[PDB]
Design an enzyme around this catalytic site. Structure first.
Site, PDB file in Angstrom:
ATOM      1  N   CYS A   1      77.196  28.024  57.642  1.00 33.12           N
ATOM      2  CA  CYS A   1      75.792  27.639  57.495  1.00 33.12           C
ATOM      3  C   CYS A   1      75.584  26.363  56.666  1.00 33.12           C
TER       4      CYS A   1
ATOM      5  N   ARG B   1      73.595  29.174  74.653  1.00 22.66           N
ATOM      6  CA  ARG B   1      74.616  29.718  73.776  1.00 22.66           C
ATOM      7  C   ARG B   1      75.612  30.663  74.429  1.00 22.66           C
ATOM      8  N   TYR B   2      75.125  31.533  75.307  1.00 25.11           N
ATOM      9  CA  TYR B   2      75.986  32.537  75.906  1.00 25.11           C
ATOM     10  C   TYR B   2      76.276  32.446  77.401  1.00 25.11           C
TER      11      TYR B   2
ATOM     12  N   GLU C   1      61.374  44.004  79.169  1.00 28.06           N
ATOM     13  CA  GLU C   1      60.132  44.564  78.662  1.00 28.06           C
ATOM     14  C   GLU C   1      60.342  45.875  77.916  1.00 28.06           C
TER      15      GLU C   1
ATOM     16  N   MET D   1      69.532  30.814  73.820  1.00 31.50           N
ATOM     17  CA  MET D   1      70.636  31.740  74.059  1.00 31.50           C
ATOM     18  C   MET D   1      71.010  31.775  75.532  1.00 31.50           C
TER      19      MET D   1
ATOM     20  N   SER E   1      67.575  36.669  84.714  1.00 29.98           N
ATOM     21  CA  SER E   1      66.750  35.864  83.827  1.00 29.98           C
ATOM     22  C   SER E   1      66.476  34.523  84.487  1.00 29.98           C
TER      23      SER E   1
ATOM     24  N   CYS F   1      73.032  34.521  51.899  1.00 27.29           N
ATOM     25  CA  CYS F   1      73.893  34.062  52.991  1.00 27.29           C
ATOM     26  C   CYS F   1      75.376  34.303  52.672  1.00 27.29           C
TER      27      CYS F   1
ATOM     28  N   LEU G   1      78.197  36.893  73.611  1.00 30.98           N
ATOM     29  CA  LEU G   1      77.230  37.318  72.611  1.00 30.98           C
ATOM     30  C   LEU G   1      77.900  38.118  71.495  1.00 30.98           C
TER      31      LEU G   1
ATOM     32  N   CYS H   1      68.439  32.814  61.608  1.00 28.04           N
ATOM     33  CA  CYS H   1      69.844  32.413  61.529  1.00 28.04           C
ATOM     34  C   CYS H   1      70.607  32.929  62.749  1.00 28.04           C
TER      35      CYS H   1
ATOM     36  N   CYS I   1      69.684  30.922  53.331  1.00 34.76           N
ATOM     37  CA  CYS I   1      69.172  32.226  52.922  1.00 34.76           C
ATOM     38  C   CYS I   1      69.677  32.594  51.530  1.00 34.76           C
TER      39      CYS I   1
ATOM     40  N   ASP J   1      60.361  34.846  80.255  1.00 29.65           N
ATOM     41  CA  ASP J   1      60.470  36.264  80.573  1.00 29.65           C
ATOM     42  C   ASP J   1      61.756  36.901  80.070  1.00 29.65           C
TER      43      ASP J   1
ATOM     44  N   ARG K   1      78.390  48.051  77.604  1.00 29.19           N
ATOM     45  CA  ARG K   1      76.937  47.899  77.710  1.00 29.19           C
ATOM     46  C   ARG K   1      76.441  47.203  78.974  1.00 29.19           C
TER      47      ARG K   1
ATOM     48  N   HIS L   1      60.744  39.917  68.950  1.00 22.11           N
ATOM     49  CA  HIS L   1      62.003  40.652  68.885  1.00 22.11           C
ATOM     50  C   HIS L   1      62.294  40.989  67.423  1.00 22.11           C
TER      51      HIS L   1
ATOM     52  N   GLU M   1      56.407  49.905  79.827  1.00 19.79           N
ATOM     53  CA  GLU M   1      56.165  48.967  80.908  1.00 19.79           C
ATOM     54  C   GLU M   1      57.170  49.252  82.027  1.00 19.79           C
TER      55      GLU M   1
ATOM     56  N   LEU N   1      76.105  35.423  64.814  1.00 14.41           N
ATOM     57  CA  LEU N   1      75.135  36.456  65.128  1.00 14.41           C
ATOM     58  C   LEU N   1      75.462  37.776  64.437  1.00 14.41           C
TER      59      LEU N   1
ATOM     60  N   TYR O   1      67.929  44.201  83.593  1.00 14.58           N
ATOM     61  CA  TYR O   1      67.574  42.974  84.287  1.00 14.58           C
ATOM     62  C   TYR O   1      67.129  43.230  85.724  1.00 14.58           C
TER      63      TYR O   1
HETATM   64  C1  FDE Z   1      71.535  41.496  65.833  1.00  8.63           C
HETATM   65  C2  FDE Z   1      70.578  40.765  66.731  1.00  8.63           C
HETATM   66  C3  FDE Z   1      69.647  39.925  66.139  1.00  8.63           C
HETATM   67  C4  FDE Z   1      68.880  39.398  67.191  1.00  8.63           C
HETATM   68  C5  FDE Z   1      67.739  38.469  66.964  1.00  8.63           C
HETATM   69  C6  FDE Z   1      66.968  38.060  68.188  1.00  8.63           C
HETATM   70  C7  FDE Z   1      65.798  37.204  68.068  1.00  8.63           C
HETATM   71  C8  FDE Z   1      65.236  36.654  66.768  1.00  8.63           C
HETATM   72  C9  FDE Z   1      65.330  36.867  69.332  1.00  8.63           C
HETATM   73  C10 FDE Z   1      66.241  37.540  70.142  1.00  8.63           C
HETATM   74  C11 FDE Z   1      66.390  37.758  71.439  1.00  8.63           C
HETATM   75  C12 FDE Z   1      67.038  38.333  72.413  1.00  8.63           C
HETATM   76  N1  FDE Z   1      68.117  39.085  72.101  1.00  8.63           N
HETATM   77 FE1  FDE Z   1      68.687  39.458  70.314  1.00  8.63          FE
HETATM   78  N2  FDE Z   1      69.298  39.886  68.379  1.00  8.63           N
HETATM   79  C13 FDE Z   1      70.314  40.741  68.067  1.00  8.63           C
HETATM   80  C14 FDE Z   1      70.903  41.315  69.111  1.00  8.63           C
HETATM   81  C15 FDE Z   1      71.094  41.477  70.428  1.00  8.63           C
HETATM   82  C16 FDE Z   1      72.021  42.245  71.199  1.00  8.63           C
HETATM   83  C17 FDE Z   1      73.063  43.212  70.713  1.00  8.63           C
HETATM   84  C18 FDE Z   1      71.630  41.912  72.592  1.00  8.63           C
HETATM   85  C19 FDE Z   1      72.163  42.284  73.978  1.00  8.63           C
HETATM   86  C20 FDE Z   1      71.301  43.420  74.582  1.00  8.63           C
HETATM   87  C21 FDE Z   1      71.979  44.705  74.176  1.00  8.63           C
HETATM   88  O1  FDE Z   1      71.355  45.753  74.093  1.00  8.63           O
HETATM   89  O2  FDE Z   1      73.191  44.719  73.927  1.00  8.63           O
HETATM   90  C22 FDE Z   1      70.551  40.914  72.369  1.00  8.63           C
HETATM   91  C23 FDE Z   1      69.791  40.272  73.422  1.00  8.63           C
HETATM   92  C24 FDE Z   1      68.704  39.502  73.252  1.00  8.63           C
HETATM   93  C25 FDE Z   1      68.121  38.883  74.469  1.00  8.63           C
HETATM   94  C26 FDE Z   1      68.408  39.599  75.858  1.00  8.63           C
HETATM   95  C27 FDE Z   1      67.300  40.563  75.803  1.00  8.63           C
HETATM   96  C28 FDE Z   1      66.114  40.684  76.341  1.00  8.63           C
HETATM   97  O3  FDE Z   1      65.465  41.564  75.728  1.00  8.63           O
HETATM   98  O4  FDE Z   1      65.740  40.027  77.316  1.00  8.63           O
HETATM   99  C29 FDE Z   1      66.752  38.526  73.885  1.00  8.63           C
HETATM  100  C30 FDE Z   1      65.846  37.426  74.522  1.00  8.63           C
HETATM  101  N3  FDE Z   1      70.228  40.704  71.074  1.00  8.63           N
HETATM  102  N4  FDE Z   1      67.166  38.262  69.481  1.00  8.63           N
HETATM  103  C1  LIG Z   2      73.980  48.448  69.222  1.00 10.81           C
HETATM  104  C2  LIG Z   2      75.477  48.056  69.092  1.00 10.81           C
HETATM  105  C3  LIG Z   2      76.344  49.150  69.768  1.00 10.81           C
HETATM  106  C4  LIG Z   2      76.027  49.327  71.266  1.00 10.81           C
HETATM  107  C5  LIG Z   2      76.897  50.418  71.888  1.00 10.81           C
HETATM  108  O1  LIG Z   2      77.712  51.028  71.222  1.00 10.81           O
HETATM  109  O2  LIG Z   2      76.762  50.715  73.195  1.00 10.81           O
HETATM  110  C6  LIG Z   2      75.907  47.973  67.573  1.00 10.81           C
HETATM  111  C7  LIG Z   2      77.430  47.570  67.458  1.00 10.81           C
HETATM  112  C8  LIG Z   2      77.520  46.343  66.485  1.00 10.81           C
HETATM  113  C9  LIG Z   2      76.281  46.608  65.613  1.00 10.81           C
HETATM  114  C10 LIG Z   2      75.839  45.464  64.647  1.00 10.81           C
HETATM  115  C11 LIG Z   2      76.961  45.172  63.600  1.00 10.81           C
HETATM  116  O3  LIG Z   2      77.319  46.379  62.907  1.00 10.81           O
HETATM  117  C12 LIG Z   2      76.525  44.056  62.599  1.00 10.81           C
HETATM  118  C13 LIG Z   2      75.172  44.389  61.880  1.00 10.81           C
HETATM  119  C14 LIG Z   2      75.320  45.560  60.855  1.00 10.81           C
HETATM  120  C15 LIG Z   2      73.962  45.904  60.186  1.00 10.81           C
HETATM  121  O4  LIG Z   2      74.145  46.985  59.274  1.00 10.81           O
HETATM  122  C16 LIG Z   2      72.921  46.283  61.259  1.00 10.81           C
HETATM  123  C17 LIG Z   2      72.742  45.071  62.199  1.00 10.81           C
HETATM  124  C18 LIG Z   2      74.052  44.706  62.944  1.00 10.81           C
HETATM  125  C19 LIG Z   2      73.737  43.450  63.790  1.00 10.81           C
HETATM  126  C20 LIG Z   2      74.506  45.875  63.919  1.00 10.81           C
HETATM  127  C21 LIG Z   2      73.398  46.182  64.991  1.00 10.81           C
HETATM  128  C22 LIG Z   2      73.884  47.328  65.922  1.00 10.81           C
HETATM  129  O5  LIG Z   2      74.139  48.525  65.176  1.00 10.81           O
HETATM  130  C23 LIG Z   2      75.177  46.926  66.677  1.00 10.81           C
HETATM  131  C24 LIG Z   2      74.898  45.608  67.501  1.00 10.81           C
HETATM  132  S1  FES Z   3      72.604  33.572  57.207  1.00 12.12           S
HETATM  133 FE1  FES Z   3      70.809  32.280  56.815  1.00 12.12          FE
HETATM  134  S2  FES Z   3      71.642  30.342  56.120  1.00 12.12           S
HETATM  135 FE2  FES Z   3      73.422  31.630  56.524  1.00 12.12          FE
END
Ligand code: FDE
Ligand SMILES: C[C@H](CCC(=O)O)[C@H]1CC[C@H]2[C@@H]3[C@H](O)C[C@@H]4C[C@H](O)CC[C@]4(C)[C@H]3C[C@H](O)[C@]12C
Ligand code: FES
Ligand code: FDE
Ligand SMILES: C[C@H](CCC(=O)O)[C@H]1CC[C@H]2[C@@H]3[C@H](O)C[C@@H]4C[C@H](O)CC[C@]4(C)[C@H]3C[C@H](O)[C@]12C
Ligand SMILES: C[C@H](CCC(=O)O)[C@H]1CC[C@H]2[C@@H]3[C@H](O)C[C@@H]4C[C@H](O)CC[C@]4(C)[C@H]3C[C@H](O)[C@]12C
Ligand SMILES: C[C@H](CCC(=O)O)[C@H]1CC[C@H]2[C@@H]3[C@H](O)C[C@@H]4C[C@H](O)CC[C@]4(C)[C@H]3C[C@H](O)[C@]12C
Ligand code: FES
Ligand SMILES: [Cl-]
Lengths: 359, 359
Positions: free
Chosen positions: B347, B100-101, B279, B12, B66, B342, B28, B132, B339, B276, B51, B199, B283, B34, B59
Site C-alpha cells: 500500500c 482486475r480479474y 441482485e 474488477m 456480466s 494497514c 479473485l 482498499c 488506513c 449491473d 464456488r 456492497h 429479487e 483483497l 450470473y
Molecule cells: C472481501 C471482499 C471485499 C469486497 C468489497 C467489494 C466492494 C467494495 C465492491 C465489491 C464488489 C463486488 N464483489 Fe466484492 N468484496 C469481497 C469479496 C468478494 C468475493 C469473495 C466475491 C466473489 C463472489 C463469491 O461469492 O465468491 C466478490 C465479488 C464481487 C463482485 C461479483 C459480484 C456481484 O455481486 O456481481 C461485485 C461487483 N467479492 N466488492
Molecule cells: C466466503 C468464503 C468461503 C466460500 C466457501 O467456502 O464456499 C470465505 C473464505 C475466505 C474468507 C475471507 C478470509 O478469511 C479473509 C478475511 C477474514 C476476515 O475475518 C473476514 C473477511 C475475509 C475477507 C473472509 C471473508 C469470507 O469469510 C471468506 C471470503
Molecule cells: S489496507 Fe488500506 S492502505 Fe493498506
C-alpha cells in the site's frame, strides 16, 4: 408579555458535579429507548452504582463535571435574542432545557412549558446527527410524557430532528479546525492527519438500521469540502464500552496504529457532540501516551475546540429554528421512516405524534 | 496519428459468459490485496472451483454473464470523444480497459500503454468510492507490475483515485431515481422508501479503517439533497457472502424488516457500483418473494437503472479527466494517508509511486 413560541433544547445532559454522577447513570441505564435488559428495573440501579466510580474518575479528569448545562443556556439565550429579531411574528421566544438524564429533565421542561401557556412548541435536538439512542430517546420521552400523564398536549408541537449538514454548523467546524491547525508547527501543518471522532454505536444498533453512521459521515464530507481537502482525514469512533462488538475503527487503535506508521501529528475533531465530554485514552492516561511516544516518536496530538460558545453557533441555531418555522414542516421526512429492524413499539407512536400535530 | 494522453479505466471486471466464471474467481481469490489466506496459492484454486457452480447460477439468473466490458467501452469511447474537444493540448486521447480479474487484465493494458508511446497515463478508477479492496487493489496492481518487469515507467503517471460526490455523478443518480419513482402508482409515490444499497465490507476491513463506508455515505447525502429529501431513505449493504461479520444492515433483512412494518413500496438504488451485478434474494429467489408477499403483503419492489449507458455519465467521466488534467494533481490528498491499521506493505509503496511521479 407572556412567551409565544417555546424552543425545547434536547440533549442527554451531563452531571454538573461528581456528585450528580450516580443519578446520571441511574436514569441512563433505566432508559428502555436506549437499551433493554432482563429485570432492568433492578439491574439498572446496580450497574449505575457499580460504574459510578469509573465515570466519576473520568469526569474528574476533565474538570470535575460536564459544562453542557451552562453552554446550552448561554447558547439558548443567544438563539432567543436573535429569534426575536428574525421572526417577530412568533415572538416572544423562550428556550427551555430538556436533558434526558439529569435536571432539568425532559418531562420537567414540558411540564413547565404547559404552564406558561405557549402557542407553539419546538422539540429541537442538539445532536446534529440522528440516532435512535440519542434524538430518538429524547423525542420518545416527550411522547412517553403525555401518555404516562394521560392527557393530550395543550400546544402545537413540531420538531427539528436532525441537521447533519447545516451550512453554519459546517462553517463552525471548519473554523475550529483551521484555528487548531495553526497551533501545529508551520512546517508540519500539511502533514497533520485530521481524525474526525464520533461516539461509536454497538453493531447490534448499526445492524438494525440506525441512521447515525451515515449522517455523521455526511457532516465529515461537508467539512472537508469547505476546507478544500487541505489535509488527509479519517472518520473513527470513540468510547466504545463493554465486550460486545461496536462500530470501529476505535479512536484509540487508530491513533496508536497511525503513529506506528509514521504519522506523528494528529488533530482530533469532536464531530458529533457539540460540548466537551470524556476524552480518549491517549489524551487522558499518561502512562499509555509515554509508551506511545517512546516507540513511535509522537510529535503532536491536539483536539479542536467544541462548538461550546462560539457566537457563530447561536447564529446556526437561530437560523435553523427560523427556517423550520417558515417551512411549516412538523418533522423531517426521515423521521416518518423507522429503522428496518426496529423492535421498539414506542418509535411508531412518537412518529405519529409529530406528524399528527395541528397546523 | 499516435496517442498522446492515455486513460486507463480500472475495475474488477466480470465474467462475460458463464464459462469465464472459473478464471474470474481464480484470480479473485489469488488477490493478496483483497484478502490474505494461509497457503493462498494452493487454497485459491480450491475455493474458486468450489464456488464456480453457485456463481454461474447467479450470473445465469441475470442474463448469463456480466456486461461490464461492453458498457465500459461505450463509456470509454464517449469519454475520449468528449476529451479531444475539452482538452486539445493533451489530445488525442485514448482509453484502455484495465480489469482486475479478467481480460483485458490491468497488466495487459499497462504493457500496451507503453508500446503506444504515451507521454502521459491516467489511472482512472471506475469506483466512485474508494476501498482498499477495490480501487486500492487495482492501483496496487499498477505498482506490482513495474515491480515485476523490473523496469520503470516510460510515461508520467497520475491518478483519479476517487470521486464520491462529483456533481454529474449525483445528477445521474437523481435522474435514474426520479425516472424509477414514476413506475410506481402516483398515489403511493410519496410513501416509496428509497433503499440505497452498496456492497458490504467485512467488519475486519471496516475496523481496519477503510474509507469506503464514509464515502458511500457522502454520495447518498448528495443525492438526497439534490432530490430535496422527497422520500425517506436508508443506506443498507448487500451481498454479505460468508459466515464472518460484515457491515450491516443487510439489504435482504432490511427489505423483510421494512415489509413487516408496513412499508410496501421499496426502491433499491445501486449507489456504489455503476454497472449491473448480482441482485438480492428477494429479487431473484421466487420462493422467498412469495412468502414475503403473503406473510406481510408487499406491493412493489423496484431497482433503479445502473449508470450504464447514460450519456450524461460519459460527460461525467470526461469532466473528471479534464479537471484532473488542469489541476495538475497526481492523486487525491486522501491517497497520501494509509488506513490506521494497514498491514499490507505494498500500500505505502503504491502511494509513493504516485506522489513521486515527474511533474
Ligand atoms: C472481501 C471482499 C471485499 C469486497 C468489497 C467489494 C466492494 C467494495 C465492491 C465489491 C464488489 C463486488 N464483489 Fe466484492 N468484496 C469481497 C469479496 C468478494 C468475493 C469473495 C466475491 C466473489 C463472489 C463469491 O461469492 O465468491 C466478490 C465479488 C464481487 C463482485 C461479483 C459480484 C456481484 O455481486 O456481481 C461485485 C461487483 N467479492 N466488492
Ligand atoms: C466466503 C468464503 C468461503 C466460500 C466457501 O467456502 O464456499 C470465505 C473464505 C475466505 C474468507 C475471507 C478470509 O478469511 C479473509 C478475511 C477474514 C476476515 O475475518 C473476514 C473477511 C475475509 C475477507 C473472509 C471473508 C469470507 O469469510 C471468506 C471470503
Ligand atoms: S489496507 Fe488500506 S492502505 Fe493498506
Ligand atoms: C449503547 C449506547 C449507545 C450510545 C450512543 C451514543 C451516541 C450516538 C452519542 C452518545 C454519547 C454519549 N454517551 Fe452514549 N451510547 C451508549 C451508551 C452509553 C453508556 C452505557 C454511557 C455511560 C458511560 C459508561 O461507561 O457507562 C454513555 C455515555 C455517553 C455520554 C457521556 C460520556 C462521555 O463520554 O462524555 C456521551 C456524550 N453512553 N452515545
Ligand atoms: C445477558 C445480558 C445481555 C442480554 C442480551 O444482550 O440479549 C447481559 C447485559 C448486562 C450484563 C450484566 C452487567 O454487565 C452487570 C454484571 C457484570 C458482571 O461482570 C457479570 C454479571 C452482570 C450482572 C452481567 C450479566 C450479563 O452479562 C448481562 C445481564
Ligand atoms: C458496558 C455495560 C456494562 C458495564 C459494567 O459491567 O461495568 C453493558 C451492560 C448493558 C450492556 C448493553 C445491553 O446488553 C443492551 C445491548 C446489547 C447488545 O448486544 C450490545 C449493545 C447493548 C446496548 C449493550 C452495551 C454494553 O454491553 C452494556 C451497556
Ligand atoms: C485459518 C484461515 C485464516 C487465517 C488467518 O486469518 O490468519 C481461514 C481463512 C480461509 C479458511 C478456509 C476457507 O473458508 C475454505 C474452507 C471453508 C470450510 O467451512 C472450513 C475449511 C476451509 C478450508 C477454511 C479453513 C480456515 O477457516 C481458513 C483457512
Ligand atoms: S430503533 Fe430506530 S425507529 Fe425504533
Ligand atoms: Cl415506518
Amino acid at each position: 408579555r407572556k412567551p409565544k413560541t417555546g424552543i425545547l433544547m434536547l440533549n442527554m445532559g451531563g452531571p454538573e458535579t461528581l456528585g450528580d454522577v450516580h443519578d446520571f447513570l441511574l436514569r441512563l441505564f433505566l432508559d428502555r429507548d436506549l437499551m433493554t435488559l432482563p429485570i432492568q428495573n433492578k439491574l439498572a440501579p446496580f450497574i449505575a452504582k457499580r460504574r459510578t466510580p469509573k465515570i466519576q474518575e473520568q469526569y474528574r479528569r476533565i474538570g470535575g463535571g460536564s459544562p453542557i448545562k451552562i453552554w446550552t443556556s448561554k447558547q439558548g439565550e443567544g438563539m432567543v435574542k436573535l429569534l426575536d429579531e428574525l421572526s417577530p411574528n412568533t415572538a416572544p421566544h423562550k428556550y427551555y432545557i430538556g436533558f434526558r438524564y439529569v435536571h432539568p429533565l425532559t418531562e420537567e421542561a414540558i411540564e413547565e412549558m404547559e404552564r406558561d401557556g405557549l402557542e407553539r412548541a419546538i422539540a429541537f435536538t442538539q445532536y446534529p446527527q440522528y440516532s435512535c439512542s440519542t434524538t430518538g430517546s429524547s423525542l420518545n420521552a416527550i411522547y412517553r410524557y403525555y401518555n404516562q400523564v394521560g392527557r393530550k398536549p395543550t400546544m402545537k408541537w413540531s420538531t427539528i430532528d436532525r441537521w447533519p449538514t447545516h451550512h453554519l454548523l459546517i462553517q463552525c467546524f471548519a473554523d475550529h479546525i483551521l484555528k487548531e491547525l495553526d497551533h501545529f508547527p508551520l512546517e508540519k501543518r500539511s502533514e497533520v492527519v485530521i481524525l474526525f471522532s464520533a461516539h461509536s454505536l454497538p453493531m447490534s444498533v448499526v445492524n438494525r438500521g440506525d441512521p447515525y453512521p451515515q449522517e455523521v459521515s455526511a457532516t465529515v464530507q461537508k467539512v472537508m469540502e469547505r476546507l478544500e481537502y487541505c489535509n488527509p482525514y479519517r472518520l473513527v469512533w470513540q468510547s466504545k464500552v463493554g465486550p460486545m462488538p461496536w462500530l470501529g475503527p476505535q479512536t484509540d487503535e487508530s491513533i496508536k496504529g497511525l503513529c506506528e506508521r509514521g504519522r506523528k501529528n494528529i488533530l482530533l475533531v469532536p464531530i458529533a457532540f457539540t460540548s466537551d465530554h470524556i476524552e480518549t485514552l491517549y489524551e487522558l492516561d499518561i502512562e499509555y501516551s509515554q509508551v506511545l511516544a517512546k516507540e513511535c516518536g509522537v510529535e503532536n496530538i491536539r483536539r479542536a475546540e467544541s462548538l461550546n460558545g462560539n457566537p457563530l453557533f447561536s447564529k446556526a441555531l437561530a437560523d435553523l429554528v427560523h427556517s423550520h418555522i417558515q417551512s411549516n414542516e412538523l418533522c423531517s421526512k426521515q423521521l416518518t421512516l423507522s429503522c428496518p429492524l426496529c423492535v421498539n413499539p414506542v418509535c411508531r407512536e412518537t412518529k405519529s405524534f409529530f406528524t399528527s400535530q395541528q397546523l
